Symmetry: C2
Subunit: 295 residues, 2 copies
């Protein structure tokens, strides 16, 4: 299809007079569109599940999860990736977001960069992509050249790949192993895919990283046991997690966390089993980091 025929580029029949509405009305129209996004995602949960299982397999097998997009799509990938080290304790190189135009594009849009198919390939080669790594290409339109080129390169190397787009049967969906295609409909402002489509992309990325990290043992119950606590709020949360999980005083909790360099998993073990920091770390290694299995 040509660009002008895409659903993402179509006019929304419920906002044709957007600029003549009162502020309240206009905002209610936008919110009516936002209401559509969680259902669009619900319909593609099976595909997202396939992608979560591939991502978990990739990270377990020593690879990385790499998000790639231009503009908004690229910034959303960087947004999700940036949250993985503080939330799940992984090194920053484990989950990576790439954006067309490089770091400057994080702060100021450079819309021309998206047109180069070879740039997506170049950015992946610059990270020394391997067949174990998983690559997720994001483009609301489903046709951004930067993303097409990146996915083609990853596919030929043997990487598991996923494509997130909001138009059906898109070029990027055709290139990828797993297609995640939440159809959100025409945007309130015609072609403004930063809106519903961007929201959908965010929901999918949060599902991918959270789903994979939970499968990898980086959570316990619904508690953030692999938090990397480097500020007041996070260290306070680390203390509260230990108390929530052991049923022991925050004091025994604080003394154990101090010894573990604020690492929650070994602190919980120390308290529940009455073992040393050193013994707790070895026990967790024996169980591949899964606290449930160590308890």
């Amino acid at each position: 299809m040509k660009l002008g025929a895409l659903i993402s580029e179509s006019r929304n029949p419920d906002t044709m007079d957007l600029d003549t509405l009162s502020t309240l009305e206009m905002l209610t129209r936008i919110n009516d569109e936002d209401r559509k996004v969680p259902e669009a995602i619900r319909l593609v949960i099976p595909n997202i599940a396939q992608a979560v299982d591939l991502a978990a397999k990739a990270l377990r097998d020593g690879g990385r999860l790499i998000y790639l997009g231009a503009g908004t799509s690229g910034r959303l990938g960087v947004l999700d990736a940036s949250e993985c080290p503080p939330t799940f304790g992984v090194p920053h190189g484990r989950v990576i977001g790439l954006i067309a135009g490089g770091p400057g594009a994080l702060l100021k849009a450079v819309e021309g960069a998206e047109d180069d198919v070879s740039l997506g390939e170049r950015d992946l080669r610059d990270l020394q992509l391997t067949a174990t790594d998983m690559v997720v290409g994001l483009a609301a339109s489903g046709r951004t050249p930067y993303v097409i080129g990146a996915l083609r390169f990853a596919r030929q190397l043997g990487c598991p790949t996923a494509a997130i787009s909001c138009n059906p049967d898109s070029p990027i969906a055709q290139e990828a192993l797993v297609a995640i295609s939440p159809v959100v409909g025409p945007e309130a402002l015609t072609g403004s895919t930063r809106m519903k489509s961007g929201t959908a992309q965010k929901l999918v990325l949060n599902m991918l990283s959270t789903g994979a990290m939970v499968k990898l043992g980086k959570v316990y119950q619904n508690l953030m046991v692999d938090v990397k606590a480097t500020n007041v709020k996070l260290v306070d949360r680390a203390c509260r997690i230990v108390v929530e999980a052991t049923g022991a005083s925050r004091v025994e909790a604080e003394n154990a966390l101090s010894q573990t360099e604020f690492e929650v998993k070994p602190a919980i073990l120390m308290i529940l089993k009455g073992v040393s920091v050193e013994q707790a770390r070895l026990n967790l290694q024996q169980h591949n980091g899964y606290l449930r299995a160590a308890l």
Copy 2:
């Protein structure tokens, strides 16, 4: 309240066994939580409207719209601001997103930066904040020191201010003129405010910038007439907008756009009124840029 008592830090009773669920189940739990976000935003539309009207007033009166947050909240402000120049044609300095820790924080989290109340003030002073500028502070928790300090500084200068938080009666809501407080409930992963709270923040920022820019005349009907077209997709959209708005051939459209340096508003006028580029630009200046008023 203490941190551990906040709704954002509370356990979600529907995800207590998150780590024992099948991938499909886990994803359905996350999506059930996402479903809650558009309704939480709907309940605070009146407050968002107040903020849209203040932002429009600020930009009309020659000021800027400045978003400020740490971590995810900060990256979301930069995400929304980055989209304003290509979508609404404004200079990049008109809508600005600030993040604790500076540009490095856009790519790699530096969670310790959020604890300094004086850093928020410093970042605003570095932009030469004036009383006409509007400052929007974002913190899911509602208590991030960087944001508290920033809002205090803006308030004392006489700036209109808004606070976006997901906990009720928060410190930042108390400091600001307008409080936007969508209560989304406990996160699927306890304390993981990048999830629902982050989604809420995104929806609110998109409402603020879109709402204000529509009020300022940067849209016509539901068409992106102030698009800054610097790539294939955007220039193609510019052509399609002219055809959609004039009922003239894409050819007359392409010739007019070439003459206007791909600026849609004057091209539409040229075609509908049969005037020169020069005459079209003057007519738009006489009508303060509002295409409807010039037609």
